[PDB]
A paper describes a structure:
In this study, we first set out to solve the open-state structure of full-length A3/B3 in GDN in the presence of a saturating concentration (2–4 mM) of cGMP. All three structures show a heteromeric tetramer consisting of three A3 and one B3. We obtained three distinct structures of cGMP-bound A3/B3 in GDN and five distinct structures of cGMP-bound A3/B3 in POPG/POPC nanodiscs; of these, five structures capture distinct intermediate gating states (two in GDN and three in POPG/POPC nanodiscs). As the channel advances from the closed state to the intermediate states, the C-helix of the CNBD moves up closer and closer to cGMP (which most likely results in a tighter and tighter binding of cGMP), and the A-helix of the CNBD and the E’-helix of the C-linker move up more and more toward the membrane, thereby pushing the gating ring (especially its A’B’ helices) closer and closer toward the membrane. As a consequence, the cytoplasmic end of S6, which is connected to helix A’ of the gating ring via a mere two-amino acid linker, moves further and further away from the pore and undergoes a slight counterclockwise rotation (viewed from the extracellular side). The A’B’ helices of A3L show the largest upward movement, causing S6 of A3L to undergo the largest dilation and rotation, especially toward the C-terminal end. The distributions of the different states in GDN and POPG/POPC nanodiscs indicate that copurified native lipids, not GDN, arrest A3/B3 in the closed or intermediate states and POPG/POPC can liberate some channels from these states and enable them to open.
Cyclic nucleotide-gated (CNG) channels transduce chemical signals into electrical signals in sensory receptors and neurons. They are activated by cGMP or cAMP, which bind to the cyclic nucleotide-binding domain (CNBD) to open a gate located 50-60 Å away in the central cavity. Here, we report structures of the cGMP-activated human cone photoreceptor CNGA3/CNGB3 channel in closed, intermediate, pre-open and open states in detergent or lipid nanodisc, all with fully bound cGMP. In eukaryotic CNG channels, the main activation gate is located in the central cavity and is formed by two hydrophobic amino acids in S6 (the cavity gate).
Author numbering:
A (entry chain A): 159 to 260, 268 to 609
B (entry chain B): 159 to 258, 270 to 554, 562 to 610
C (entry chain C): 158 to 609
D (entry chain D): 206 to 572, 577 to 643
Write the structure that this text describes.
Amino acid sequence: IVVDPSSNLYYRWLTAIALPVFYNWYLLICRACFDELQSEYLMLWLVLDYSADVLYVLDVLVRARTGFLEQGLMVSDTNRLWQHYKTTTQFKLDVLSLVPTDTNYPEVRFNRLLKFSRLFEFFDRTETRTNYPNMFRIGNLVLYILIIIHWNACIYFAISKFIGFGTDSWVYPNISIPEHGRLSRKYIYSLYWSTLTLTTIGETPPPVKDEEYLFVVVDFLVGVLIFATIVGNVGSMISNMNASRAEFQAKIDSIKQYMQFRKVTKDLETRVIRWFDYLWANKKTVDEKEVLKSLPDKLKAEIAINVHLDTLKKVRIFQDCEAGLLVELVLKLRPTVFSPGDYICKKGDIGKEMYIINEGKLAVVADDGVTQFVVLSDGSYFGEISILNIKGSKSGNRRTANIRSIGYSDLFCLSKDDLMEALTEYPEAKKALEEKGRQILMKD
Amino acid sequence: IVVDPSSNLYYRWLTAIALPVFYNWYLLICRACFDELQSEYLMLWLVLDYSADVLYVLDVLVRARTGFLEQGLMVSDTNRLWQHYKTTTQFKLDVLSLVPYPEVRFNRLLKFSRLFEFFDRTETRTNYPNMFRIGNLVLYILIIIHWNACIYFAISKFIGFGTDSWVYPNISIPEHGRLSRKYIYSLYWSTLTLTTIGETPPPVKDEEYLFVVVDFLVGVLIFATIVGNVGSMISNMNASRAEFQAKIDSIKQYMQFRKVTKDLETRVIRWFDYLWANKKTVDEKEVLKSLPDKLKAEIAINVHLDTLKKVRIFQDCEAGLLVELVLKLRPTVFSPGDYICKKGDIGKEMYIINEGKLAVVADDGVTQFVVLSDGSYFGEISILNNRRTANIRSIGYSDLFCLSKDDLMEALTEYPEAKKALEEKGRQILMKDN
Amino acid sequence: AIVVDPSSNLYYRWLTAIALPVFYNWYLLICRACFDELQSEYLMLWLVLDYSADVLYVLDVLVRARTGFLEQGLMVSDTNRLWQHYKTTTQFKLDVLSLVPTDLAYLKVGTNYPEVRFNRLLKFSRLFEFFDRTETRTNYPNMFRIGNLVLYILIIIHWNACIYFAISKFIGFGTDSWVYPNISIPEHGRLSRKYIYSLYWSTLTLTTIGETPPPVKDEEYLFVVVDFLVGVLIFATIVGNVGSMISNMNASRAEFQAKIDSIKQYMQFRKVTKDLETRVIRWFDYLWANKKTVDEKEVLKSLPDKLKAEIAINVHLDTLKKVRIFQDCEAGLLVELVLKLRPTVFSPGDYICKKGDIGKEMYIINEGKLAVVADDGVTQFVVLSDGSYFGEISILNIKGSKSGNRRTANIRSIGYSDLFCLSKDDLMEALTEYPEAKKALEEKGRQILMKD
Amino acid sequence: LPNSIDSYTDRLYLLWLLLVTLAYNWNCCFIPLRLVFPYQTADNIHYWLIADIICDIIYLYDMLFIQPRLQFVRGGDIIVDSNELRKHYRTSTKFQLDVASIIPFDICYLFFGFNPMFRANRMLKYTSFFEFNHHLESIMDKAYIYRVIRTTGYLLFILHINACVYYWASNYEGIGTTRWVYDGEGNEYLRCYYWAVRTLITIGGLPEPQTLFEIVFQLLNFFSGVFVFSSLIGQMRDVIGAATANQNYFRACMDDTIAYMNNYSIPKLVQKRVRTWYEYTWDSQRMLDESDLLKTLPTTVQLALAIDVNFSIISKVDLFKGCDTQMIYDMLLRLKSVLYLPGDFVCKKGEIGKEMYIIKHGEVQVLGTKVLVTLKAGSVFGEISLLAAGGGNRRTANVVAHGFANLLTLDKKTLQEILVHYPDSERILMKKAR
Ligand SMILES: Nc1nc2c(ncn2[C@@H]2O[C@@H]3COP(=O)(O)O[C@H]3[C@H]2O)c(=O)[nH]1
Ligand SMILES: Nc1nc2c(ncn2[C@@H]2O[C@@H]3COP(=O)(O)O[C@H]3[C@H]2O)c(=O)[nH]1
Ligand SMILES: Nc1nc2c(ncn2[C@@H]2O[C@@H]3COP(=O)(O)O[C@H]3[C@H]2O)c(=O)[nH]1
Ligand SMILES: Nc1nc2c(ncn2[C@@H]2O[C@@H]3COP(=O)(O)O[C@H]3[C@H]2O)c(=O)[nH]1
Ligand SMILES: *[C@@H]1O[C@H](CO)[C@@H](O)[C@H](O)[C@H]1NC(C)=O
Ligand SMILES: *[C@@H]1O[C@H](CO)[C@@H](O)[C@H](O)[C@H]1NC(C)=O
Ligand SMILES: *[C@@H]1O[C@H](CO)[C@@H](O)[C@H](O)[C@H]1NC(C)=O
C-alpha cells in the first residue's frame, strides 16, 4: 500500500523510528566507550540492538512505499515509488546502515548511526506540528547540548583509556582503586570534565603531555564554536518568545515618550494609557490583516467566517441572499475599536464608512442633549445612507444622526467605494439596503 | 462595591499584594533551607506570616468582587462576578494557597500571577520603562541566585558538613558557624557557579558532581538569558538614534556618490543638527497610528488649539470645524532663508504659522512689508481666485502647518459664513495690492 | 560681546577644550583620592593641573552664560535674556556647586584629602554633550561608538580598581589572601605595581574571568559578589554592544545579500532561463558596484520639500543643461520636471521600446549609451548619449503621419544605461500651463514625420 | 592568457585569486612564526627562501600581467581596450597598495642578515584576499558554509598571532625564569597556542603573572580577548542568522497564524487546511509570497521575469493566439498567483464569474458529480467572464481542483479596462466566444 507523508500514520511511524536512531547515537556509543558497561549488560544490549535492526529493516521497507508530490497530486504507483526511492542517496544511506557486521567491541556497529536524516525529519515535523513551537526549539537545542556533552565525555574517557589510566594528572585515575572503579563514577566524572571543557569554565586538571595539550586545545575550540553557535541560538529563541509583548511595549513607550515630550495633559494621558491597557487586557492588539496578508482569499474568508460567525449571523436582509457575497464582504471588512463616550457619526459630516456592531452597544444620541433614542446591540448596523447616496429623499449627503458609545465598543468599518465595487455585481441586496434607506428617510 | 480593574485603586492593591508574595518566595526558601533564620526570629516570622495570610485572604475577596468586561461595559452583578471568578483556575490556585519547619508553607508561593501582573502593570504605567525592565531583570537573577544558594546549603546539609571539600565546612567551628557567614558563603558559591566562573572547590562525591553539572548547564542558560535581555535592552534603547543615524548615513553616502556642493551639504548637516538639537526625530504620523481616531484628534486638538488661540482671522470656527482641521493639519519645518511661495507660482496650500517668524519680500529684494509672526496665518488668497501674490521668505527656523486643497474645500461645508467673510478679506487684499 | 553659535565649530572646539579637564578630573581625581602616594609624589603637577581645571571651569561658566538658544526660529543674542535663561536652569545650580572654592578647605585640612575636590566631577553633562556632538559630527561612527564604549568601561575598570585598593587599604595590607599584599615589601611597594596589579584585579573581576585569590572575610565575600554581578552585566553590555556594532557595520550588505538570495531562490523555483539568471545577477553586481541600490525617493522621503527639490537640482540639472530642447523652455518647467523625474536603471541588450507599441513614457538618458536599431539585428542607425531624449511624441496624441502614437522604432541599451522616466499622466497633469513644450514637441512631431 | 580578464565568468581568474590568496596567507601566517619561533634555522633556509621567492614571483605576476587586464565599467559601457585598462588600473588604490607591498626588502638581507621583519610589506596586499572572498561568496550556492569556515579561520589566525606574541614575551623575559612564561619542555608552538586559547577565550587556569610586564601583558590580553570572543559571538550569530533568516521568517509567520487561529478558537478542519497550505507553500515555493519579492525590483526586470515564466503558458493556449503583445506584457505583469488545496471549489455553479484562471502546476477537473474534462497544466478556464457587465453570467459548471492546483488569477474588471484599448483583440475574443 501507500502512506501519506502529511498524515498522522507517517508521523506516528516517524516517532517509532526516531526512537532507535537516538538510542543508537547516545546509548550505543555510550556503551561502546564503556566496554565494561557492555560486559555488565550484554543480553539487554543485544535485545535492544536486534530491535533497532528490525526497525531499520521495516524503515527501508516503508520508505520504499511512501508517496511524493508530482503535479500537485499524490502518486500511488508502487513501482514508480520504488524507482524514485532507488534514484536517491538517502536509500544508499539506508543500505549502508543495514549491513550485518556483528559481541565484544561495539565500534563495529557504527553503521547504524547513518540514519540521522530521519531523526532530523522527526524534529522538524514535531516542531511544525506542536502547539509550543519556541519551547520545543529550546528543548531541541538543549537536547543537542546534552548529545555533545555525552559524546565528548565518551571521547575523553576513551582517550584516557588510550593514554593509560592514572599515569598523569589530566587523565582519568587508576581503575583498580574501588573508588574510581565504579561505572557510575566513570560516566559521571567524564560528564563533569566535558561539561567544564565545553562550557569553557576550565577548572579541570591541566594537561601534561602533548597529545593531551592538542586534545584540550581542539576540545576548547569546538566548545567555543559549538556553544556560541548553539547557546546563542537559544538567546535568539528567547527574544522570539518575548517579541510580541516587546513590540507592544515599543508602541507604548514611543507613545508615552511623545506625550512626555509634548507635555500633554494628565486627563488625556490617563485616558490613552487606559485605552492601551484595555487593548492589552482584551488581547485585540494583533492586527489581523497584517498577520494574514500572506494567505489567499478563500482561507482568509473562511478564517473570518469562523471567527465572526456568532455576531455576523444576526443580519436580516443579507443573510441568505448570497453566501459568496457575505464571504467577499467579510473578507473586505476592517475592524476598529472605539472608546466609551465617542462619536461614530455627527450631524453634517461626509459619510464614507458603514459600521457592523460587534460586541458592543451604541446609542443614537440627540443633537444637543443626551437622550438615548435607541441602543443598538451586536448584529445590527448603521451608517449606510451616506454611503448609498440615493435620490428621492431629503438627500443631505451627510451623516444624519449622532451615534455615541456607552462602552468599549468594537465596530466593523467598510469603505463606501469598497461596498460599491462589492455590490456592482450584486444589485439585489443593494436595492434592499436602498429600500431600507428610503424607509429611514420617510420616517425622519 | 465593585473594583475597576483598570483603575488606580486596583494598582495600589497589586502593590499591596505583590509585597507579601515577594516576601514568600525569598524568605520561605531561605528559612526552609537554612533552619536557623527560622529558629532565631520565630515570633517575627510568625507575625509576618500571619500578615501574609491576611493579605492572601483579602486578595481572595478582592478577586471575588473585581469586575470584568462583557459587551464593553462594567459588570456590577456581584453574583455574576462570583460565578465568573469561581469557574476560573485562579480561584482554585487561591484556595490551594490558602490551605493551613517552615517547609509546610510552600503552598504560599502559588500566587505568582499577582506578582507577574503587578510587574506587567508597572511596565505599562511607569515613565521609566527601560529602567523598570533592568530592575525586573536584576530582581529575577537575584531570586535565581538566592534560590541556588539555598539549594546548595540544603545539599550540603544532606551530605553532611565538612566531610568532603565541596560541601560547606564544619558548622561546629565558629568561623563557619555564624548565620551571616553561612548565608554570604552560599551566595558566593551560587554567584560563582551560575555566572560560570568556576573558582569553587572541586566536587568529590557522585551526587556533588551531578549537581555541579546540572548547575553549570543552568548557569550557561541563565547567562545566555542575561546576555539576550541586556542586548535587547541596548537595541530598543538606542534604536531611534540608530535609525536616524542610518537616515543621516544614507543621505550622506548618496550625496557623496552624487558630489554635492558645499553650501547645500552644509545646509543638510545644519538641518539634521537642528533636528538633533530640538528633538524632532519623532514622527507624528508614524507614531500615532496605533491610537483610535478621536484619541488621535484630542492630543492634536490640544496642541493645535494651543497654536490656534494665537491666530486672529480664522478663529470663527469652533468644535466641528477645528476637529476636521486638527485631524487633517500636518506640520512642515522650513530652514532660515527659505522661500515658502514665490511670485510666479500656482497656489495649492494654506499655512498656519506656529514657532516661526516669516517676512514677505519684493522681487529678489529684502524689504519687510509685513513680518508674519505667531498670531496670523497666510496663503489662502491664491486658491479661490492666477499665481501666488508676492515672495515669502523665512527669517529663522520656521514651522508651518500645511493644508491641502481638499481640506479647505471640505471645510467650506460647515460654518460657511466665516469662510465667505475671510475670502471677502482675500478680495480685500487683492483690491489693495492690485 | 559676541554670542557663540551652539552649532558652530568654535563651540565644538570649546566642547573639546572643556571635555578634556572634566575627563581628567574623573579619572585622576578618583586615582588621587584612592592612592595617596600618586597624590603625594607629583603634588606640584597636580596643583598646576587643578589650577588649569579651575580656570577652564570658570571659563566654561562664562561661556555657558554667553551662548544663545533658538526660540521662535531665531537665535537670541540679548545677553541679559541669556543670563536670565541660564540663571533659571539647573545647570547653573550644578555649576555653582561645582565651582565651590575648596582652596580654603584644601589648606584647612592640610593636603591629605583630595576628596574635597569631588564636586568638580559634576560637569559630566558637558562631557556627555561632547560625546553626543562628536557622534553626530564624525565620519567613523562605528569606530567612535567602539572608542566611547571602551572609554566608558575603562573608566569603570579604573574606578573599580581604585575602589579595590581603597578597600584593601581599609582592611589593611596583606592580612589575608584576597586584599592587596603587605606594602612594606619593596616588590609590592612600587606605585606602578600597585596600580597595575589593582587594574589587573579589576579586569579579572569585571570581565567575569576571575583568577584572583578567593575571599576570606564577610565584607570581601559581599564585595566580590556585588562586583561579580556588576561584571556580568558589564560583560552583557560589551557583548550586546559589539553585536550591535557588527550588525550596524554590515546590515546593508546583509539585506542586499538577502535580496540576492531570495531572488535567486525565486528564479531557481520558477525555472527561468540561465542567461536571464546571469543577467539579473550581473545587474545586481553592477548596482552594488555603482553605489546605487536604494531608490532616491526612499532616500529623500524623510526630507522637506524644498530641500528635496534642491537635491533634485544638484543631481539632475548638470545633465539637463546638456539638452537640445530646453533652450527654448523655461525654468518653471525645468523645476517641475526635476520634481517629476524618477530614475530607472537598465541592462545591456534590454529593449526600451520596440517598433509599434503604444508607450506613454518619456525618457532622459543619464550616464548611458543607447541606440535606435531595426528588427534585423544590430543595425544601429544613430547612437544616443547623455543629454538626449526620446518617446516624447506618443503622449500628446498628434498625427500628421500614418502611425499615430506608436513607437516608431526599437531602442536598445548598449551599456549599463540609466534613464529618467517621465510617464504620460504625471507630466500631462503637472504640465498644464506652458505651451513652450507644446510648440517644441509639435516641431518634433513635424520633423519626425519629415524623417519618417 | 586572454587579452582582457573579466570578473563574472573567469574560473581561471578565480584560480589566480586562489593562488594569490594562498601566497598572501603564506606570508601573513608564516612571517610572525619565522620571526618569533626558532624555526628559520640554517637547515630549512633553502625552503623558506624558495617559498618567499615563489610568493614574490606570484606577486610580481599579479602586478604585471593579470591586474592590468581587469575589465571595468566607465560611463555605462564596459571597457575592453588595453591602454585604457592599464591607465585605469594604474590610477587606482590597488596599484599603489601592490607597489607599496612589492618594495623588495630582500636587499636588506645583505645589510642586517636574515630577518623576516623586513618582509612585513607583503601583508599589505589584502585587497586580493578580499576580492577572492567576494568572488567565492558570489559563485557558491551555500555561502554560509564558507562564511563559517572563514570566521573559524579568522579565530585560528588571531590565536596564532597571540601564540607568537606570547612566545616573544617569554623570550624577552627569559625562558623558564618565572612561572608565567613558557617553561620549555614540550612542543613550543603547541604549548604557546594552548596559552593563546586559554587567554584569548578568557578561560583562565594558567599560572599567575609575577612581574610587571607579565601583569600588563595578561591584562591587555584578557581585555582584548573579551572583545575577540564578543566579535566571535557576533560574527557567528550574524552569519547563521543571515543563513536561516528565510526559514525563520516563514516559521514565525506560520506560528503567528496558528497563534491567531487558536486565540480565536478556529475549528480543526480549517486549522488543518491552513497547516496544509503553509506546508505545501514551503515545499513548493520556498517563500511566503512572490509578489512582495517582485514589487521591490525595477519594472523592466519585473516584466522580464514575468514574460519568461508565463509566455510559455499564455502562448500554449490556442485561445490566446489572436491577442497583441502589449496586452500580453501588461497582463503577464499584472497576474496574481494563488494556490488551491485539494478538494476545493474554485468556481461553484451559480456564482458570478469575475476571474480568468490560468493553470500552472496543477490538475483541476470540471464536474453534477460526473467529470466532463480534466485540465492539465498550462490550460485555461473561465473565459465566459469577458462579456459579463456587473453580474452578467453565472458559472456554468462545478470546476474542482483535484490536486494541489496553483492557479494564476486574472480579474474581470482589469481585463475589460485594458481590453477596451484593443478593439481587434476584443473582436477576436468575442468571435472565439461565439
Ligand atoms: N436618521 C436615522 N438614522 C438612524 C435611526 N436609527 C438608527 N439610525 C442610523 O443612524 C444613522 C447615522 O448615520 P447614517 O446617516 O450613516 O445613517 C443613519 C442610520 O443607519 C433613526 O431613527 N434615524
Ligand atoms: N498680497 C499679500 N498677501 C499677504 C499680505 N499679508 C499677508 N499675506 C498673505 O500672503 C500671501 C502669499 O500667498 P497668497 O497669494 O497665497 O496670499 C497672500 C496672503 O494670504 C499682504 O500685505 N499682501
Ligand atoms: N524614429 C526616430 N526616433 C528617434 C530618432 N532619434 C531620436 N528618436 C526618438 O526615438 C523614438 C523612439 O520612440 P518614439 O516612437 O516614441 O519616438 C522616437 C523619437 O522621439 C530617429 O532618428 N528616429
Ligand atoms: N462548462 C464547462 N466550462 C469549461 C469547460 N472547459 C473549460 N471550461 C470553463 O470552465 C468554466 C468554469 O466557470 P464558468 O462557468 O465561468 O465557465 C466555464 C468555462 O469557461 C468544459 O468542458 N465545460
Ligand atoms: C593501579 O593500581 C595498581 C594496584 O594498586 C597498581 O599495581 C598499578 O601500578 C596502578 N596503576 C598506575 C598507573 O599507577
Ligand atoms: C566538627 O567539629 C566537631 C567538634 O568541633 C566534631 O565533633 C565533629 O565530628 C566535626 N564534624 C565532622 C564532620 O568531622
Ligand atoms: C608586613 O611586613 C612588615 C615588615 O616587612 C611586618 O613587620 C608586618 O608584620 C607585616 N604585616 C603583615 C600583615 O604581614
